C-alpha cells in the first residue's frame, strides 16, 4: 500500500534515545507551564485507561510484517530489516523503561495472548534469520532483539501478575502458547554449529532457563 507508516517507527525509534526531555515527556504521557497542565489533562481523557500505551505498542507490532515474510524468503527481510530493527528497538525501549503502580489491566499478558500470537511470529522470524546468514548487517541485532523481547514480555507478564494479583491461573496460560519457548532439540542444534554467535545462544539458553522455571513453579 505505502511505506508511510515506516517513517513513524523511526521517529519513535530516534526520539526515545534521550533519557531527559524525550523520554521523561513520553513517560509522563504514557503512564499518566500552568495552562498546559489543564490542556494535557483535557487531551488525555479526550483520547478514548492506558489506551495510549496499548495503542502505541500494538501499532509498533504492526509494520513488522510477520504474516508477509512468513507466508512466502530472504528478499523481504533484506528489504525490511531497518524498519523491523527500529520497531523492535522502540518496543524494547517501551517494555524495559516505561512499563515498570497505577495500572488496572495486564498489558504484556494481553499482548502475548492476543489471538495473533506475535511471540510465535517473532520466534519463527528468529529461526528464519538464523537460517539464512549461516546457510545483511542488522540481522545479529534483530535476533537478539526478538529473543530479548520475548523474554522481557514473559517476565513482565509474571511481574505484573505478582503486582496485581487478580488472575492466579496464568502460569498455565503462559505455558499454553503453541509455538513459544523453543525446544531443547533446536538449542542442541544451536550449541553445535560454529556459525552461530555467543550472545544468540546465550539469549536462547536464558529463554530455556525461563521455560524450565515456568514448569517448576507450575506445580
Amino acid at each position: 500500500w505505502g511505506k508511510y507508516q515506516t517513517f513513524g517507527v523511526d521517529i519513535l525509534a530516534k526520539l526515545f534515545s534521550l533519557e531527559k526531555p524525550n523520554l521523561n515527556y513520553f513517560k509522563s504521557i504514557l503512564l499518566n507551564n500552568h495552562k498546559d497542565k489543564k490542556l494535557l489533562r483535557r487531551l488525555l481523557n479526550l483520547y478514548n485507561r492506558h489506551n495510549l500505551l496499548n495503542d502505541v505498542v500494538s501499532f509498533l507490532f504492526s509494520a513488522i510484517p510477520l504474516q508477509q515474510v512468513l507466508s512466502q524468503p530472504s528478499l523481504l527481510i533484506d528489504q525490511f530489516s531497518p524498519v523491523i530493527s527500529q520497531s523492535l528497538t522502540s518496543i524494547l525501549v517501551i517494555v524495559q523503561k516505561i512499563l515498570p503502580f497505577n495500572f488496572n489491566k495486564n498489558l504484556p499478558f494481553v499482548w502475548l495472548s492476543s489471538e495473533e500470537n506475535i511471540g510465535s511470529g517473532l520466534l519463527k522470524l528468529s529461526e528464519i534469520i538464523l537460517n539464512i546468514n549461516n546457510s545483511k548487517v542488522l540481522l545479529p541485532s534483530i535476533n537478539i532483539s526478538c529473543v530479548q523481547l520475548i523474554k522481557c514480555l514473559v517476565e513482565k507478564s509474571i511481574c505484573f501478575e505478582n503486582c496485581l494479583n487478580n488472575d492466579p491461573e496464568i502460569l498455565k496460560k503462559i505455558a499454553s502458547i503453541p509455538n513459544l519457548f523453543p525446544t531443547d532439540l533446536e538449542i542442541f542444534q544451536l550449541f553445535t554449529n560454529p556459525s552461530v554467535d555467543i550472545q544468540i545462544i546465550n539469549q536462547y539458553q536464558l529463554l530455556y532457563n525461563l521455560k524450565n522455571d515456568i514448569l517448576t513453579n507450575l506445580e
Partner: protein, 80 residues
C-alpha cells in the same frame, strides 16, 4: 454464520492449547528422567570406585559385574 465460525475457532484454539501443554509436560518429564538416570549411574560408579579399598571380593565383583551389564524389559508378541 458468525456464531458457527467463532464456535469452531474457540474449539480449535482450546485443542491447540491442550496439545501444547501436553507436549511441554512430556519434554519436561523426559529431561527429568535423563537427569535422574545420569545422577544415579554417576553416584553408583563413584561409590563403587571408592568402596573397593574372601567374601568382599566376591560381592564387590558381583556388583561390578551387575553394573557392567544394565538390562531392559522383555517386550514381544504373544505366541500362544
Amino acid at each position: 454464520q458468525m456464531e458457527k465460525l467463532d464456535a469452531k475457532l474457540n474449539h480449535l484454539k482450546k485443542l491447540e492449547k491442550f496439545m501444547e501443554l501436553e507436549r511441554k509436560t512430556l519434554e519436561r518429564q523426559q529431561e527429568n528422567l535423563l537427569i535422574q538416570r545420569l545422577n544415579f549411574n554417576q553416584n553408583s560408579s563413584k561409590i563403587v570406585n571408592v568402596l573397593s579399598k574372601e567374601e568382599i571380593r566376591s560381592q564387590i565383583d558381583h556388583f561390578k559385574s551387575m553394573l557392567s551389564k544394565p538390562e531392559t524389559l522383555s517386550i514381544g508378541k504373544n505366541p500362544f
